[PDB]
Amino acid sequence: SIVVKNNIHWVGQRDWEVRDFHGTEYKTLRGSSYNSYLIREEKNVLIDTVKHKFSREFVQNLRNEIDLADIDYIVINHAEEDHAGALTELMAQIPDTPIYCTANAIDSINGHHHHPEWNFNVVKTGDTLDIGNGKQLIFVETPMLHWPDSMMTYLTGDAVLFSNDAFGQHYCDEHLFNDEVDQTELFEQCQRYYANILTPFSRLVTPKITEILGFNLPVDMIATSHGVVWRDNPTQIVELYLKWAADYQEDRITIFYDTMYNNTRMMADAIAQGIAETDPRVAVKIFNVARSDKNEILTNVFRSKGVLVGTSTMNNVMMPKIAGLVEEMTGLRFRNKRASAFGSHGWSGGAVDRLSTRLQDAGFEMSLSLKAKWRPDQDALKLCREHGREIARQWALAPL
Amino acid sequence: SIVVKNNIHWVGQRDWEVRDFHGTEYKTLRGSSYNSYLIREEKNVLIDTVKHKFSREFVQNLRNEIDLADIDYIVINHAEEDHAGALTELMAQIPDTPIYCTANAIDSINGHHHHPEWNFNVVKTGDTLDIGNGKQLIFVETPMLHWPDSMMTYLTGDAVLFSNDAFGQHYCDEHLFNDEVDQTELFEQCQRYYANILTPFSRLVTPKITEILGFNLPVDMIATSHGVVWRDNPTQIVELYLKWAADYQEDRITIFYDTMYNNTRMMADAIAQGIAETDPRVAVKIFNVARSDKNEILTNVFRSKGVLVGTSTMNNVMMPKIAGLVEEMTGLRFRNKRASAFGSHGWSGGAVDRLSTRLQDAGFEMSLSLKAKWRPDQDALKLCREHGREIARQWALAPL
Ligand SMILES: Cc1cc2nc3c(=O)[nH]c(=O)nc-3n(C[C@H](O)[C@H](O)[C@H](O)COP(=O)(O)O)c2cc1C
Ligand SMILES: Cc1cc2nc3c(=O)[nH]c(=O)nc-3n(C[C@H](O)[C@H](O)[C@H](O)COP(=O)(O)O)c2cc1C
Numbered sequence: 001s002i003v004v005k006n007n008i009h010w011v012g013q014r015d016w017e018v019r020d021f022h023g024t025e026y027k028t029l030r031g032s033s034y035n036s037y038l039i040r041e042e043k044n045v046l047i048d049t050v051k052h053k054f055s056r057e058f059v060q061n062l063r064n065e066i067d068l069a070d071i072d073y074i075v076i077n078h079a080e081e082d083h084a085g086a087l088t089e090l091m092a093q094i095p096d097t098p099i100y101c102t103a104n105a106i107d108s109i110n111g112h113h114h115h116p117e118w119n120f121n122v123v124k125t126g127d128t129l130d131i132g133n134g135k136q137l138i139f140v141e142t143p144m145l146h147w148p149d150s151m152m153t154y155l156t157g158d159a160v161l162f163s164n165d166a167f168g169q170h171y172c173d174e175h176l177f178n179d180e181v182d183q184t185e186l187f188e189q190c191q192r193y194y195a196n197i198l199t200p201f202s203r204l205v206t207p208k209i210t211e212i213l214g215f216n217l218p219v220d221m222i223a224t225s226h227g228v229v230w231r232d233n234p235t236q237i238v239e240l241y242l243k244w245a246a247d248y249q250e251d252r253i254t255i256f257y258d259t260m261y262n263n264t265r266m267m268a269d270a271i272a273q274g275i276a277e278t279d280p281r282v283a284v285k286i287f288n289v290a291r292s293d294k295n296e297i298l299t300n301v302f303r304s305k306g307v308l309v310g311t312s313t314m315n316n317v318m319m320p321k322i323a324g325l326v327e328e329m330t331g332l333r334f335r336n337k338r339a340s341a342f343g344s345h346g347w348s349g350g351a352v353d354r355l356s357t358r359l360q361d362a363g364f365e366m367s368l369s370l371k372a373k374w375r376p377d378q379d380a381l382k383l384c385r386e387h388g389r390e391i392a393r394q395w396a397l398a399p400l
Numbered sequence: 401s402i403v404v405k406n407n408i409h410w411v412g413q414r415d416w417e418v419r420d421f422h423g424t425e426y427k428t429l430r431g432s433s434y435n436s437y438l439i440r441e442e443k444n445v446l447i448d449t450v451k452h453k454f455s456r457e458f459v460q461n462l463r464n465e466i467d468l469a470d471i472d473y474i475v476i477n478h479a480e481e482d483h484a485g486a487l488t489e490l491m492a493q494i495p496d497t498p499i500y501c502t503a504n505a506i507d508s509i510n511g512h513h514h515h516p517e518w519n520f521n522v523v524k525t526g527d528t529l530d531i532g533n534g535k536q537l538i539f540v541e542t543p544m545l546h547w548p549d550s551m552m553t554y555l556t557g558d559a560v561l562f563s564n565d566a567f568g569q570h571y572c573d574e575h576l577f578n579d580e581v582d583q584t585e586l587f588e589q590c591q592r593y594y595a596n597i598l599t600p601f602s603r604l605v606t607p608k609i610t611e612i613l614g615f616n617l618p619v620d621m622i623a624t625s626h627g628v629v630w631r632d633n634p635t636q637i638v639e640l641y642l643k644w645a646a647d648y649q650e651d652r653i654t655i656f657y658d659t660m661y662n663n664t665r666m667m668a669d670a671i672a673q674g675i676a677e678t679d680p681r682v683a684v685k686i687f688n689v690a691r692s693d694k695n696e697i698l699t700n701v702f703r704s705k706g707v708l709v710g711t712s713t714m715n716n717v718m719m720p721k722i723a724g725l726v727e728e729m730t731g732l733r734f735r736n737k738r739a740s741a742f743g744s745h746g747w748s749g750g751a752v753d754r755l756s757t758r759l760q761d762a763g764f765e766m767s768l769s770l771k772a773k774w775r776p777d778q779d780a781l782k783l784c785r786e787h788g789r790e791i792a793r794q795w796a797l798a799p800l
């Protein structure tokens with residue numbers, strides 16, 4: 001175990017191998033960690049557990065740190081399998097130990113573990129739990145961030161905020177603190193995490209953070225459930241969340257597509273050239289959805305002021321990977337972004353109009369579409385390049 | 401080159417490495433071949449070419465077989481890149497050589513190659529082309545099988561039908577004839593080809609085959625553009641096409657799903673058990689779309705009387721791989737099939753109803769949906785197993 005601060009001990013699990021989260025919809029290219037914490041004052045408190053995969057290691061490591069019978073309280077901020085997965089294994093040894101969680105958490109814990117006989121203690125925002133030596137735990141409900149059962153736990157005196165998923169990231173390292181790891185990799189994983197997970201709940205992020213700041217509680221460290229512990233200027237991740245929640249966008253345009261014979265690809269490249277020669281201020285990224293990392297694309301969309309999506313017509317409908325990605329964007333609910341559909345067809349086409357409608361359903365402000373027949377010749381590529389010019393001028397943040 | 405029959409020579413290209421067709425939407429697990437044919441009578445006729453990738457090999461191999469200036473006519477049954485890709489390379493050496501094709505083919509050839517100055521000869525069904533020695537070519541238009549430009553070429557005397565894509569399959573082997581290869585692998589690739597490509601055009605297959613048979617033309621061999629040449633009982637593939645075109649279905653049910661925490665998976669397994677214990681006549685297949693071959697799933701759907709599709713609710717919508725697969729099935733237009741949606745959710749759900757609607761849009765006759773909250777307990781698994789019973793009884797081809 002590792003000492004976080006004073007009597008706070010890290011008893012979590014590092015995961016160097018993990019590459020698949022949420023089935024296969026979140027790629028963790030730099031692994032992850034599942035942070036669990038043991039506070040040892042007059043009372044002994046365990047905050048969260050780990051993924052069920054590492055349940056046998058978690059309990060064994062916990063035994064080496066403390067006698068299981070000496071654990072007074074267990075706090076579950078979040079009952080997702082990556083934090084409450086080892087709960088059944090633990091409660092098998094100490095079935096009488098009280099569990100402090102939200103009312104919604106009782107539903108989610110019982111939903112996964114099927115042990116309603118456990119001793120649950122419903123907490124709400126403002127409720128306190130004394131652990132001795134002048135210190136206490138303060139609970140703050142954070143529903144739909146990102147689950148109905150989500151909450152945070154604040155420790156007085158030591159001034160440590162256990163925020164669980166919030167402000168966390170999928171980044172594995174032997175070092176525990178934020179000032180001990182590579183800043184670029186840390187930032188990338190942080191923004192990747194928010195873009196793919198917390199984007200649809202951005203409207204709830206700002207008022208909740210404002211509420212927490214209203215409590216006037218000092219924060220020396222922010223102990224998340226994923227990745228590093230923020231100790232050096234810990235509120236930097238809070239400020240990033242405030243910026244990211246305000247319908248974040250840079251002067252950036254993301255282009256992604258799928259293709260069978262590279263006809264749509266040639267259209268995408270021509271559009272990009274038109275943009276770059278019209279507005280040098282705009283950053284342009286191009287991805288083939290069949291050949292690229294899906295979560296990297298979505299992170300770029302989150303950063304972009306607008307997107308262009310390409311697809312060829314196949315059996316009167318759009319390419320499936322495009323349809324799948326559009327469905328996902330419909331759930332992430334991006335705001336204040338614009339979009340334009342394009343692609344090639346053989347005869348009757350129809351997939352571009354179909355795509356344009358579904359992008360509109362996803363919440364994008366739609367511009368005119370761009371269509372081409374078979375492989376674009378020099379004249380057709382001019383039209384594609386002209387489309388990029390028209391898009392650049394329309395989506396301009398500032399004149400010229 | 402290989403002698404097909406008399407003066408008919410195979411001058412195509414084998415592709416052992418190929419794994420991706422139509423972008424990445426068709427996996428060729430056993431490679432493929434691109435069959436081109438050179439007929440040498442009084443006139444010399446080249447039928448189709450090969451993929452553009454092998455253009456330099458194709459021309460060089462063609463030179464070794466015959467002087468390029470001695471080629472009288474070029475026949476293009478189909479202008480898709482895997483058959484007409486090496487055309488520009490060839491016409492650069494012999495620009496005056498006439499091209500015989502459909503009216504729609506002029507649009508598709510020029511669409512890919514941008515050389516409208518080529519000498520095109522529009523042919524329609526019934527048109528003939530004498531090549532000497534009492535032999536001639538007879539052209540038969542096959543629009544939307546699978547392209548608007550598609551046609552077949554029949555050679556009199558030798559009685560060889562050049563059917564291009566039709567009756568072909570993606571199967572690579574050193575041996576050229578159907579009686580020289582593994583029958584099981586051949587059948588599998590044949591059915592895989594029809595299910596993923598020709599299913600939406602099944603209504604056109606039967607009348608077209610009926611029309612061809614009406615011509616009373618003898619067929620000794622069927623030389624496709626993909627895979628083996630049918631010489632031993634060559635009409636067996638024609639009969640399979642007739643069976644497959646009649647809204648083909650066996651006593652079979654396909655179940656596929658995507659999941660994040662295996663909750664939906666446990667539902668799928670319970671449903672299967674309920675079916676198998678209710679109707680022993682039914683064959684059941686289960687696939688995880690994120691972990692399985694997409695084209696194998698679709699081949700099973702083609703063979704199935706009905707399907708069950710599972711998904712969890714993620715950001716109020718369905719899993720993207722499921723959305724993508726449903727979009728593709730909407731294009732394949734399966735007929736006379738039934739479906740049932742299922743899956744797990746956390747709180748409000750909604751993805752199952754969303755999926756049920758889109759399956760209905762895909763043409764499936766929808767039965768009642770099955771829903772569960774979090775991880776199904778013993779009581780919930782009974783309900784899932786009961787759902788399988790209800791489905792089995794409803795979809796029964798015969799009583800009991
Ligand atoms: C399997 C298949 C199905 C197709 N279906 C259609 C169609 O329904 N409507 C259409 O206009 N073109 C259709 N096409 C033609 C393509 O849209 C055309 O070749 C396009 O220019 C290729 O786009 P891409 O190279 O960007 O993938 C189809 C092509 C293939 C291979
Ligand atoms: C990222 C994420 C988003 C979710 N969104 C919803 C939702 O919008 N509505 C809902 O009812 N449950 C939601 N859930 C909960 C899951 O539907 C629930 O855990 C389900 O039982 C898991 O299904 P599975 O294991 O088959 O993938 C979400 C879960 C995750 C991880």
Ligand SMILES: [Fe+3]
Binds near residue numbers: 078080165
């Ligand atoms: Fe979570």
Ligand SMILES: [Fe+3]
Binds near residue numbers: 080082083165225226
């Ligand atoms: Fe988590």
Ligand SMILES: [Fe+3]
Binds near residue numbers: 480546565
């Ligand atoms: Fe084809």
Ligand SMILES: [Fe+3]
Binds near residue numbers: 480482483565625626
């Ligand atoms: Fe082909």
Ligand SMILES: [O]
Binds near residue numbers: 082083165
């Ligand atoms: O989580």
Ligand SMILES: [O]
Binds near residue numbers: 482483
């Ligand atoms: O093809």
